[PDB]
Type I-B CRISPR-associated protein Cas6 (Nostoc sp. 'Peltigera membranacea cyanobiont' 210A), 216 residues
Amino acid sequence: LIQSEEYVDLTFKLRGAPIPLDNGYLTYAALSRICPPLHELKSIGIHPIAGIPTRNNLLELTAQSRLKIRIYHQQIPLIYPYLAGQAFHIGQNFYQLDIPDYKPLISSESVYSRLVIIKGFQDSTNFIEAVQRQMDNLGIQGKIELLTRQDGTPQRRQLTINKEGKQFKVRGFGVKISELNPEDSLTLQEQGIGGKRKMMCGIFVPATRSKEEEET
RNA sequence: UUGCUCAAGAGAAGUCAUUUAAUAAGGCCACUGUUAAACGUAGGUGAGUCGUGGCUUUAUGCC
């Protein structure tokens, strides 16, 4: 019920060819090529693209699919002229961005993260204690829950970094966090958890997305 | 047993051979969608895969 200040969500309407579901490095590299200043930013995160799943491991862009960027509101003039109205290419297809819209950062009792990556922690217990430690670093109190598939197993996801010729394997979990109160909820949403925040992972969304991801 | 009782109009046959509905034609010439305005002030979101790889002190984050 509290709208966070100093942090907004720059949302660009996204359209183009069907896109891989594990975009990650693809989208980040395309934006970096379009926007050189995006590489050197620190407290910025890119939202997972919202669109229905298509065949293979691809993702199809809808009219409701939009590229959303979480950024300090004073740092917008550093990336706005490079992104607003410009076009970026993923592979061989051209994708166009229009004038973005600003969305305030709303507080929620229960927040959700698609994907949390912590270096060197692969098992569930070590991952959970690592996220507890990360909460302790930023002073947030809450209960950690892990998203589960239809079988109840904790969910794992993989991030593919195609740096140079070799391709890289970086993996993490998808958590659901509640019992946060609005102030700490906003603090967690702005700061995020884990690493690879610009890498389409580590950011937090309300728990409606948590249930939606739990569906499929 | 009925002006009745019985009682095949039956056998066979190509409507055939040949013929351009053809020669010619502009839906054409003309048209302003003219003229005027303070944004005043308050309407929201749909979804994967599975056991360390180049930097960085394990840390913890970058590619």
Notes: Chain A is about 25% helix and 30% strand. The helical segments of chain A are 25-34, 37-40, 80-83, 124-138, 182-191, 207-215. The first strand of chain A starts at residue 3 and ends at 15.
